[PDB]
DNA sequence: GTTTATTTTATTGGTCC
DNA sequence: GGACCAATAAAATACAAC
């Protein structure tokens, strides 16, 4: 377990949202572009989209 | 909105029983006090944070 | 100004090709 | 092996009551 969670930067988050608008699913090539461009882990990025996906589903509340 | 004192005592009763809670328990517990498993789940989640804030009671 | 409920990282364990 | 899902926790926030 452990792995104390760390709040991402607004800059990074913005770029994250930016691309998620383009595609809800991410290509193994964009991920490498996105990571380097935001200094994160591909695994982290995949986790973001992995999690971002569930957010949208929750908007079903609307 | 505030949870009942009796309900409260019920919670801490089980919380001393176990910091984390089995789904089997959440049942009895939610029904036992008519709550929401989300709610019961949420209390325990926030409950643990209290314990990390023990400052000589 | 102090004391329930939502949102955000993150791992775990199931699937499906 | 890689992608996806959901269940679940903890840290961080938020917002109401009091």
Numbering used by the authors:
A (entry chain B): 216 to 277
B (entry chain J): 221 to 277
Original paper wording:
However, analyses of the formation of TF complexes on DNA have revealed that many TFs also bind together across the family boundaries, in a DNA-dependent or DNA-facilitated manner. Because the DNA-bound TFs are fixed at particular positions relative to each other, the contact surfaces required for cooperative DNA-facilitated binding are very small, and can evolve rapidly. We also generated an unseen test set by solving six structures that represent several TF–TF–DNA complexes bound to optimal DNA sequences. The structures included two BARHL2 homodimers with two spacings, HOXB13 homodimer and TEAD4–HOXB13, MEIS1–HOXB13 and FOXK1–ELF1 heterodimers.
Recently released versions of RoseTTAFold (RoseTTAFold2NA v.0.2)39 and AlphaFold (AlphaFold v.3.0), which can predict the structures of protein–nucleic acid complexes, performed much better in predicting the overall geometry of TF–TF–DNA complexes. However, only AlphaFold 3 was able to predict the structure of the HOXB13 homodimer.
